Design a binder for these strands. Structure first.
Ligand SMILES: O=c1ccn([C@H]2C[C@H](O)[C@@H](COP(=O)(O)NP(=O)(O)OP(=O)(O)O)O2)c(=O)[nH]1
Ligand SMILES: [Ca+2]
Ligand SMILES: [Ca+2]
Ligand SMILES: [Ca+2]
Ligand code: NA
Ligand code: NA
Ligand code: NA
Ligand code: NA
Ligand code: NA
Ligand code: NA
Ligand code: NA
Ligand code: NA
Length: 899
DNA sequence: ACAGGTAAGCAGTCCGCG
DNA sequence: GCGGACTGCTTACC
């Protein structure tokens, strides 16, 4: 096979690389890499090197990387540009791997690990590491084995060995329910003291040195705790064995927190992968909470605090450590963020951990692209941060909206880049700008008949291929492929959901099918003959396939959109507000241009004049009122809901879209752009069920609306799905039970009508005081707690949730065991009734947890349900209903005086 | 440091206001 | 005594 790197590091004048060779074997080499950099040279000097603007350069070869760095400094002291890749690791990778890297993941050692540390005096700070590590579970992807290191003897208690027999048993048997599929993969190792455990773990680490190191909070806890514990016991030299090159770096942050860099290892903390690639915002990021959300597994159960779990139930203590490791593996099997990181890393030719940085990622992609044409990248430059304009958002008229069709553009900003040909080296000049509405209304004079233009005043060459459009197109094409798999899996899911209405009472097996492609008629025929058992399993596999496609497509979209963003970041080598503004301004034009065209077209085909069909728009999307399109045929002519949905689906696809296409083609000609790439397709078809009292949808303002959708991007839902954007139901800060209640309120409004809403509201008001306290607690991030802490009491302008944290700290003051609120993390927040013993109007505690038993009964007694209801529930419901012009309570009338 | 701008709602402080 | 304007903070949409 073709060789590929695993890790790369620069240590002085040496490049340390771990790699898989042509025979599939892992090797490590030290290379005294000789880097090249470039300087501008006279035009009379023949050369094959030119900067991106066509200016000749000469290559400077250096004896070592230090000499190259020193040359950069001297060139700065002179005041001349030093061109070329200044990150020598990237240059080395580009030189060593001058081809499209095809990698074998089975050869890459991916380690998942988690440690346990018993601490009687609160959280065990990794920088201090003063408590023994009494458990380590380390999963190796090559061995496919869970290596368990169990400390039997500790100053905090001596315990018996963990039993794998009891671990495998059901909880109803007094067992731990360690999943049966990993029982045979567990390698258990007990130790009679910590030093022997740690020394053995280090020897194990050397035999099976991780390339990718992951787990949950491993970067902020596990890794620095292990490193510091070993350092304090054996000394620094021994602790450095955690690095295959014996090189570590301790980066410190004083509040005393440390993040350790282990040279020769690529750490991908799964919590960071999750936060960056999952596109969620969670009320809590404990592994317990995320596992429940992602996998629908039950919360792990135990009696008493975790600080005494080992002493009381060491059996369960070890089993849960093992399970914790497995849960992350299970989450990755679903989300596949590791696969994504490897894909993007090898594509860009970067250190795998650099997938967290789209700027580093794009710098390497662009550098490799340019290097292939003997072109020389410019030197990075210092720039001041400056604001610049973005997208346009229309101000909607707050109202209900019965029938709605939405449209938006495919990969908006990257498509603008490709269409206009926006790149650092394709800039041709400028023109005099007319007001933006003059271009929107096709009144302003044509910017140029030679160059491709944006209404911000920028002109670009039409003939030349720009490196930014060239490379963004490649990644965009990957994105488009994976989205196809996602939507097909999604459409397949609905087919299965339909067949789950007539499950055949028989015994069979799920059909072997590739869910990435639309089911063939043969498959569909067989599906209508399957048992509920097989169908539900197929639905599970379809949804897993969809999530896999979702991860692949949405994060490639994120990457290309971040290339747009990078143009507006001063640390990007190709930072340029001219290009960034060219993109957003063109986008503003395009949206408001097509709003006009759509309005004009619909009035024409309907026969009316001057009526507003586009009720709302944001960035690249429009929302079209389809009431008059429906009324043109009259509701009577429709058999059922699905009939008019088919009608609108056809109408948009056969009539509106071609008109939209003509409109954008004209705009492309107007701006004399390189290639027409404004592709606007139908998104949602929304409306009430036929013959119902549902209102279909409503807007309360910008970025706040709800729609009862029947079809979304070609997916015909088995049951109508609510599309709610911005409303409190969508916010992680809104209490769980309130989200649920508000959503059902919205469902009833859009699908059933006012009377249904009023029934549900009355019921919720009566019964809500029985809801679990966690389900009705608000959530908030806890930033700058100390900033507002004046002697344990709220300082000036102390935020509500911060006030609640201070209340908590006073209540638990003097308890070294009580859970402490962590700066930057999230808290549950509850209001307290007047005269409560806590001395304040609210209290907060670490999210994802039960509040400590020290004060739990007191908090439950003094919760302010009244404030909770009015503030979190009634107030936003009032906003929904006022906009929709409805009432959630029966109003008073003259009829009230009849019996 | 190490993708971007737009925009919503909640709550605290201050100032005008017989 | 507190409404309205303004600010900080948080978390959305795109
Ligand atoms: O995170 C984002 C999201 C959107 N945007 C900008 C660029 C994007 O093209 C534009 C439209 O947002 P969309 O939600 O429509 N995503 P996009 O148009 O890129 O892709 P697609 O609609 O094909 O999925 O808003 C960002 O800059 N960052
Ligand atoms: Ca011993
Ligand atoms: Ca779009
Ligand atoms: Ca059937
Ligand atoms: Na743990
Ligand atoms: Na059970
Ligand atoms: Na130390
Ligand atoms: Na689309
Ligand atoms: Na007319
Ligand atoms: Na959009
Ligand atoms: Na189309
Ligand atoms: Na879409």
């Amino acid at each position: 096979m073709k060789e590929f790197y695993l890790t790369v590091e620069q240590i002085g004048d040496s490049i340390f690389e771990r790699y898989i060779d042509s025979n599939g074997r892992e090797r490590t080499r030290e290379v005294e890499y000789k880097p090249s950099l470039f300087a501008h040279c006279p035009e009379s000097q023949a050369t094959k090197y030119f900067d991106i603007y066509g200016k000749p350069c000469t290559r400077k070869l250096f004896a070592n990387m230090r000499d190259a760095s020193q040359w950069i400094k001297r060139m700065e002291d002179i005041g001349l540009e030093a061109l070329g890749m200044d990150d020598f690791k990237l240059a080395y990778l580009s030189d060593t791997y001058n081809y499209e890297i095809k990698y074998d993941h089975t050869k890459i050692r991916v380690a998942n690990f988690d440690i346990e540390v018993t601490s009687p005096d609160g959280f065990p700070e990794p920088s201090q590491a003063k408590h023994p590590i009494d458990a380590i579970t380390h999963y190796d992807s090559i061995d496919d084995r869970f290596y368990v290191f169990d400390l039997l003897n500790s100053p905090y208690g001596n315990v018996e060995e963990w039993s794998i027999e009891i671990a495998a048993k059901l909880q109803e048997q007094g067992g731990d329910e360690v999943p049966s599929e990993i029982i045979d993969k567990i390698i258990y190792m007990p130790f009679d003291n910590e030093k022997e455990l740690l020394m053995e773990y280090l020897n194990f680490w050397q035999q099976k040195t991780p390339v990718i190191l992951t787990g949950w909070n491993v970067e902020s806890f596990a890794i620095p705790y292990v490193y510091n514990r070993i350092k304090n016991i054996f000394g620094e030299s021994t602790a450095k064995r955690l690095s295959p090159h014996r090189k570590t770096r301790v980066k410190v942050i004083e509040n005393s927190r440390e993040i350790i860099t282990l040279f020769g290892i690529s750490v991908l903390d799964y919590i960071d992968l999750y936060k960056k690639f999952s596109f969620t915002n969670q009320p809590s990021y404990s592994l317990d909470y995320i596992s429940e959300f992602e996998l629908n597994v039950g919360k792990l159960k135990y009696d008493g605090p975790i600080s005494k779990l080992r002493e009381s139930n060491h059996q369960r203590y070890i089993s849960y450590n093992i399970i914790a490791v497995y849960r992350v593996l299970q989450i990755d099997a679903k989300r596949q963020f590791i696969n994504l990181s490897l894909d993007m890393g090898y594509y860009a030719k970067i250190q795998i951990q650099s997938v967290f940085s789209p700027i580093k990622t794009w710098d390497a992609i662009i550098f490799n692209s340019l290097k292939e044409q003997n072109k020389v990248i410019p030197q990075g430059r210092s720039h001041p941060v400056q604001p610049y304009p973005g997208a346009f958002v229309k101000e909607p008229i707050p109202n209900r909206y019965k029938y709605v069709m939405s449209f938006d553009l495919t990969s908006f900003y990257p498509s603008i880049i490709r269409q206009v040909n926006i790149s650092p080296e394709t800039i041709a000049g400028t023109f005099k700008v007319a007001p933006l509405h003059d271009y929107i209304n096709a009144v302003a004079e044509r910017p140029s008949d030679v160059y491709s233009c944006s209404p911000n005043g920028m002109m670009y060459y039409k003939d030349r291929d720009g490196v930014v459009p060239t490379e963004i197109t490649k990644v965009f094409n990957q994105r488009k492929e994976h989205k196809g798999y996602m939507l097909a899996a999604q459409r397949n899911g609905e087919i299965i959901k339909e067949a789950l209405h007539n499950p055949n009472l028989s015994v069979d097996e799920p059909l072997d099918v590739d869910y990435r492609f639309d089911f063939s008629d043969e498959i569909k025929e067989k599906i209508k003959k399957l048992s509920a058992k097989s169908l539900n399993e197929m639905l599970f596999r379809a949804q897993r396939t969809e999530v896999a496609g979702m991860t692949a497509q949405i994060n490639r979209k994120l990457l290309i959109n971040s290339l747009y963003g990078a143009l507006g970041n001063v640390w990007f080598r190709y930072y340029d507000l001219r290009n960034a503004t060219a993109i957003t301004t063109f986008g503003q034009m395009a949206l408001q241009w097509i709003e006009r065209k759509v309005n004009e077209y619909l009035n024409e085909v309907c026969g009316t004049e001057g009526e507003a069909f586009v009720l709302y728009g944001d960035t690249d999307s429009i929302y079209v009122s389809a009431d008059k399109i429906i009324d043109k045929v009259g509701e009577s002519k429709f058999r059922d809901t699905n009939h008019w949905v088919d009608f609108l689906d056809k109408f948009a696809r056969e009539r509106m879209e071609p008109a939209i296409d003509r409109g954008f083609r004209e705009m492309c000609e107007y701006m004399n752009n390189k290639q027409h790439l404004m592709f606007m397709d139908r998104e949602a078809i929304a409306g009430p069920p036929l013959g119902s009292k549902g209102i279909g949808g409503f807007w309360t303002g910008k970025k706040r609306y709800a729609l009862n959708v029947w079809d979304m991007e070609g997916t015909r839902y088995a049951e109508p799905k609510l599309k709610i954007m911005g409303l409190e139901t969508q916010k992680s800060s809104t209490p769980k039970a309130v989200q649920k209640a508000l959503k059902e309120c919205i469902r009833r409004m859009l699908q059933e009508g006012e009377e249904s809403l009023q029934e549900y509201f009355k019921e919720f008001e009566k019964e809500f005081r029985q809801l679990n306290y966690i389900s009705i607690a608000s959530v908030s991030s806890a930033n700058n707690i100390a900033k507002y802490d004046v002697g344990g009491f709220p300082g000036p302008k102390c935020p509500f949730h911060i006030r609640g944290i201070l209340t908590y700290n006073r209540a638990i003051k003097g308890n070294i065991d009580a859970p402490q609120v962590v700066e930057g993390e999230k808290v549950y927040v509850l209001p307290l009734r007047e005269g409560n013993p806590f001395g304040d109007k609210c209290i907060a505690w670490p999210s994802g947890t039960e509040i400590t038993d020290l004060i739990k009964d007191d908090v439950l007694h003094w919760m302010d349900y009244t404030v909770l209801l009015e503030k979190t529930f009634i107030k936003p419901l009032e906003g929904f209903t006022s906009a929709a012009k409805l009432d959630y309570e029966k109003k008073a009338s003259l009829f009230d005086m009849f019996d």
